[PDB]
Design a protein around this ligand. Structure first.
Ligand SMILES: OC[C@H]1O[C@@H](O)[C@@H](O)[C@@H](O)[C@@H]1O
Ligand SMILES: OC[C@H]1O[C@@H](O)[C@@H](O)[C@@H](O)[C@@H]1O
Ligand SMILES: OC[C@H]1O[C@@H](O)[C@@H](O)[C@@H](O)[C@@H]1O
Ligand SMILES: [Ca+2]
Ligand SMILES: [Mg+2]
Length: 760
């Protein structure tokens, strides 16, 4: 089945820079990674690279960095004359292949992964005479380029003088060793990491600085085996040696293991018989993408996980976020459930427990960003690890989807208490006014407050800066408005917690836009989101909240409660189930009563106003900041009444609102802060699009959802081409932006294949 899907993504490339970046600093080629391994490979792009898989991509703890263009590239010689080949090269799901054809010699090379640190190359040589084989390779020297043009003349060795890369010959191949580099934002190594090449035949080797040439003589047709391993610690190096020996002893077993695992992914995943071949190919692209973004355990993360993009500037290594994970695992349940489970385990593995050394006031909290390296507060030197905030909680939904597929009650029993703890954390630490309806917010953190618990902020006016602390001081500063900007690190983190960090509803609007808003009769203060601290009965600072309750977050919590009730029932906990059903109903009541505006027929966030309203609502719906995808969150999550759903669907289908060339973007055309190229104020994301179609379907509008899915399929640029999957789309033009090989887009493209794509 895999052979039906050749070159789904363009995996060719010959990188010339460690950082061979696209316009947005992502690696501009798409290497093949599998089994959660920490290195990847490209296909040759022509004569200069044929005979090898160029562009060895090393995952250096938290970043993707190219090591070499040609490395272990084969050329073949007969009587001192080089054999001239023509090349066929292609990817399939789970392998890279190249075939070299000449009259009297042919070579077929197949590359698959064998372990979480090792790939296996089969070099099948057909020849009716003896041959001399030569392999060559060279480490990269240049540091950085953007769209193929150098950003500077900086060198790798110049930039990282301790990297001290060295090639050494071994008793069966060679190794590259690497010195310790703790470049927090760029390159992280232990000083014990190596890239190892082991082969099934003796070779002779000449090393010339950062290049090598190795040779062997064969008698005729033969199949050789080569392992390539990126090993990140001394312990990994030592442990891999027995695995390498086993692979070279029984290579057929490892090739077959990979073949069968991939056949299973495709068999389990490709289950929509109404899909066209073109739609099926998108599903396969999604599967390849998600599986490539899977990382095996590394560093502080003791579980397999999935990152948002192995090629991403800030998304690589094993950097893992919660709401990415929920979406990833929801889709991966349907083809790679073992890793869907692991990915969820990885996020919960650093959930805060009672007596935590850093934040004992945050029991149940799930960190925003976990990674190989712990932060200095937890004894590491990692700069990415983030506990300033979490992400929106679709955890129970994700866990339940794995259960729906596997029917494994032990999985529900494993996750239930972790889900309960998280649920409880939101209600303690993200409910400023104690009404059971959450806010996005931020933790107590070194970045957010002084050691005495006073909130930090920086008031900027022209080129003058003033850093102050204290919520009372913050209050006065907001009242007077004598600043160009007010930077509050806790409120930045709150925007991160929402997942949509420049959304209109959180106060973000450009100058020209706000000027027009004012000219039309609005006030600038309508865009000010106020901020508050959350304290326990005994006065302990628990964190912070926006003085605003978000309709998406309420709706996700509604679903959390619903899924927790379902799980409690499965686990024979009827009284817990009854309590969660009550909490769900109370949230649905608040969502419908408080967040639905009948005049504009849509749902919105509400402010937490100085005094609550007579109906118990914390404030009025924030209609004046315009409509966004949060307004269909009550439909997706099932909190909406039918009547309110009917109203929202009419708005979604309106070409003046959201029914655009690519429909269901992150702000309606009528939103005062709309911009077609703005990430969270117009651009279409696949998650929010699929949430909208699912919401439509839930309330009896599957036919209209199918139509929108067809519009998406026809208009989203690049969908049926061989480019990597990105983050979002211009709603007017369909043009793509964002990191290549983006996981949750893959996840929701797969779900669209499952749920809505079909032959017309
Ligand atoms: O060893 C096979 C071939 O290797 C090449 O690199 C050259 O050294 C050739 O002269 C030789 O015939
Ligand atoms: O774009 C990546 C950034 O995304 C935000 O939502 C947070 O998770 C940050 O910690 C992270 O650096
Ligand atoms: O993909 C990882 C994270 O990247 C950030 O830039 C935001 O888009 C977050 O919503 C997301 O969770
Ligand atoms: Ca509240
Ligand atoms: Mg921190």
């Amino acid at each position: 089945n895999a052979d039906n899907y050749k070159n789904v993504i363009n995996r060719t490339g010959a990188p010339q820079y460690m950082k061979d970046y696209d316009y947005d600093d992502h690696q501009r080629f798409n290497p093949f990674f599998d089994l959660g391994a920490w290195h990847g490979h490209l296909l040759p792009d022509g004569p200069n690279t044929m005979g090898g898989f160029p562009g060895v991509a090393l995952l250096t703890e938290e970043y993707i960095n190219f090591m070499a263009s040609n490395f272990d590239r084969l050329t073949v010689w007969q009587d001192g004359k080089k054999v001239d080949f023509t090349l066929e090269a292609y990817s399939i799901p789970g392998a890279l292949v190249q075939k070299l054809t000449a009259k009297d010699v042919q070579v077929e090379m197949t590359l698959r992964f064998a372990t979480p640190r090792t790939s296996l190359l089969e070099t099948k040589i057909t020849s009716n005479k003896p041959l001399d084989l030569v392999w060559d390779g060279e480490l990269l020297e240049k540091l950085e380029a953007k769209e193929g043009k150098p950003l500077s003349d900086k060198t790798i060795a110049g930039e990282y003088p301790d990297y001290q890369r060295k090639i050494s010959a071994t008793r069966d191949g060679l190794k590259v060793t690497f010195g310790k580099v703790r470049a927090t934002w760029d390159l992280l190594t232990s000083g014990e990491s190596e890239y190892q090449v082991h082969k099934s035949l003796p070779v002779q080797t000449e090393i010339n600085g950062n290049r090598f040439t190795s040779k062997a003589h064969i008698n005729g047709s033969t199949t050789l085996y080569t392992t390539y391993s990126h090993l990140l610690t001394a312990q990994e190096v030592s442990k891999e040696q027995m695995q390498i020996r086993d692979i070279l002893a029984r290579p057929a077993f490892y090739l077959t293991a990979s073949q069968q695992r991939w056949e299973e992914y495709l068999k389990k995943g490709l289950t929509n018989p109404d899909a066209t071949p073109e739609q099926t190919r998108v599903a396969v692209k999604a599967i390849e993408t998600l599986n490539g973004n899977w990382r095996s355990p590394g560093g502080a993360v003791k579980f397999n996980t999935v990152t948002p993009s192995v090629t991403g500037r800030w998304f690589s290594g094993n950097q893992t976020w919660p709401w990415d994970t929920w979406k990833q695992a929801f889709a991966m349940a349907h083809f790679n459930p073992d890793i869907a489970k692991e990915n969820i385990r990885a996020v919960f593995s650093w959930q805060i427990q009672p007596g935590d050394s850093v934040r004992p006031q945050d029991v149940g909290f799930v960190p925003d960003l976990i990674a190989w390296n712990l932060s200095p507060e937890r004894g590491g030197d990692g700069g990415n690890w983030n506990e300033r905030n979490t992400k929106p909680s679709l955890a129970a939904w994700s866990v339940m989807e794995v259960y729906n597929v596997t029917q494994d009650k032990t999985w529900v029993a494993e996750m239930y208490p972790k889900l309960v703890a998280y649920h409880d954390w939101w209600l303690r630490n993200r409910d400023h006014n104690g009404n059971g309806v959450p806010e996005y917010g931020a933790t107590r953190d070194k970045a957010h407050n002084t050691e005495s618990g006073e909130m930090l902020f920086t008031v900027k006016k022209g080129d003058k800066e003033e850093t102050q602390s204290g919520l009372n001081n913050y209050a006065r500063v907001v009242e007077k408005g004598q600043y160009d900007s007010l930077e509050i690190p806790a409120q930045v983190a709150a925007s991160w917690e929402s997942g949509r960090d420049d959304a209109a509803v959180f106060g973000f609007i450009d100058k020209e836009q706000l000027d027009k808003y004012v000219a039309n009769g609005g006030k600038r203060s309508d865009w000010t989101v106020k901020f508050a601290e959350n304290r326990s009965q005994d006065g302990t600072l628990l964190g912070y909240s926006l003085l605003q309750e978000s309709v998406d977050q309420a709706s996700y919590m509604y679903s959390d409660n619903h899924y927790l009730a379902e799980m409690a029932t499965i686990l024979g906990k009827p009284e817990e189930a009854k309590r969660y059903r009550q909490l769900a109903q109370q949230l649905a009541d608040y969502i419908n009563t408080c967040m639905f505006d009948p005049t504009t027929q849509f749902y919105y966030d509400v402010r937490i106003e100085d005094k609550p309203l007579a109906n118990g609502c914390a404030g009025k719906p924030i209609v004046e900041r315009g409509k966004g995808p949060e307004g269909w969150s009550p439909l997706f999550n099932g909190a909406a009444t039918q009547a309110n759903a009917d109203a929202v669907v009419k708005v979604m289908l309106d070409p003046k609102e959201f029914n655009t060339f690519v429909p269901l973007g992150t702000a309606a055309l009528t939103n005062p802060a709309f911009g077609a190229d703005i990430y969270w104020r117009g651009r279409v994301w696949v998650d929010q699009f699929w949430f909208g179609l699912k919401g439509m379907e839930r309330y009896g509008y599957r036919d209209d959802a199918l139509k929108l899915a067809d519009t998406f399929f026809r208009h989203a640029k690049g969908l049926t081409a061989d480019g990597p999957i990105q983050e979002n789309y211009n709603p007017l033009t369909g043009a793509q932006q964002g990191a290549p090989n983006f996981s949750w887009s893959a996840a929701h493209l797969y779900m669209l294949y499952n749920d809505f794509f079909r032959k017309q």
